[PDB]
Amino acid sequence: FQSMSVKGRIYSILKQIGSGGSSKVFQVLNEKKQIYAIKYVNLEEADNQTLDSYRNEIAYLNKLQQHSDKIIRLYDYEITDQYIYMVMECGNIDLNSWLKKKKSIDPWERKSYWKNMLEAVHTIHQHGIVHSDLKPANFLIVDGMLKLIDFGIANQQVGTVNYMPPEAIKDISPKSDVWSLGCILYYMTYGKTPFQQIINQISKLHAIIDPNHEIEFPDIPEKDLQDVLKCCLKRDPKQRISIPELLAHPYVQIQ
Ligand SMILES: COc1ccccc1Nc1cc2[nH]c(-c3cnco3)cc2cn1
Numbered sequence: 303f304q305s306m307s308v309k310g311r312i313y314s315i316l317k318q319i320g321s322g323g324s325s326k327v328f329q330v331l332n333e334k335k336q337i338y339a340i341k342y343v344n345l346e347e348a349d350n351q352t353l354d355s356y357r358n359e360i361a362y363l364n365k366l367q368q369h370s371d372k373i374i375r376l377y378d379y380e381i382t383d384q385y386i387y388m389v390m391e392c393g394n395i396d397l398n399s400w401l402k403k404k405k406s407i408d409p410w411e412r413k414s415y416w417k418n419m420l421e422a423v424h425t426i427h428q429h430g431i432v433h434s435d436l437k438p439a440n441f442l443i444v445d446g447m448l449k450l451i452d453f454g455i456a457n458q459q460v461g462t463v464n465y466m467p468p469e470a471i472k473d474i475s476p477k478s479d480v481w482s483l484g485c486i487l488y489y490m491t492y493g494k495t496p497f498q499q500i501i502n503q504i505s506k507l508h509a510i511i512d513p514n515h516e517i518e519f520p521d522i523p524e525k526d527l528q529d530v531l532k533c534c535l536k537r538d539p540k541q542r543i544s545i546p547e548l549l550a551h552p553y554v555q556i557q
Contacts, residue, residue: 306330306340308380308387313340319392322458324348329392338377339393343386352457356386359456362431366453369429372422374442374449393442393449398459401438401489409524412490415441416530417554418448419483424545426453427476434474436482437465438489463503464495468511468537477539480548484534491527492520496535513537526553 304315313330316337320327324344331337345353360381366373375391397415401407419441426433433440433454441448467481489495496517500506509515517535519528530553533543548554 337392339390341388355457362453370425372418374451393444397441398438415448422450423479434478471507471511477542
């Protein structure tokens with residue numbers, strides 16, 4: 303019923319999808335009755351460092367459009383001193399809500415999603431971006447295809463420590479993203495993150511960095527999937543598999 307204008311084009315709001323601090327995401331319809339997602343950002347209480355982090359992220363989203371379809375489509379935007387309006391493609395659901403709603407995941411679906419995550423994250427690395435806070439909430443299902451929605455640049459399932467690499471707890475390398483992606487895949491395999499059993503956040507951080515804390519990798523029919531997991535979840539980033547290596551791995555390549 304409500305409406306909004308973005309670069310002269312009018313959009314009618316269908317429903318609110320997301321909500322950040324000063325941001326809101328809405329499912330909308332244009333004049334041609336085409337569906338889109340509009341992200342609204344209130345810049346009223348935003349300082350210069352915040353504004354520039356927002357502008358840097360918008361520029362990377364706009365640039366990386368061309369380089370990969372595993373990155374969310376950004377059709378247009380309007381930016382003033384009071385607000386940002388971002389016209390994007392609308393997803394069906396984020397990966398976190400999908401993983402929470404669905405109990406068991408198909409191995410084919412899992413493999414397909416993993417490929418998409420690698421392609422998206424690989425793309426940002428080729429441009430010098432290390433996300434450093436990947437979690438299922440950063441991925442959107444858009445027509446049986448996972449797409450990355452953000453680059454971790456803009457000032458921010460927020461707070462979560464379950465996908466955090468041991469090197470990030472000690473303190474900035476593409477290997478940090480590999481650990482996080484490994485945690486997402488571990489969740490899509492075992493239905494839990496590697497340290498989800500630890501309630502206490504301090505004890506949890508202690509176990510992620512603890513080399514004497516053996517991560518369990520229960521036996522599964524996909525031995526190649528178990529290997530990817532063991533390779534991503536190597537505490538020493540030097541011993542950790544890289545994205546180009548993950549793309550050549552049997553799990554992703556072999557039918
Ligand atoms: C029906 O739409 C959804 C329902 C539940 C969760 C997600 C979606 N779809 C959606 C959510 C979105 N969030 C962003 C976004 C937030 N920050 C940058 O892009 C784009 C987007 C595009 N489509």
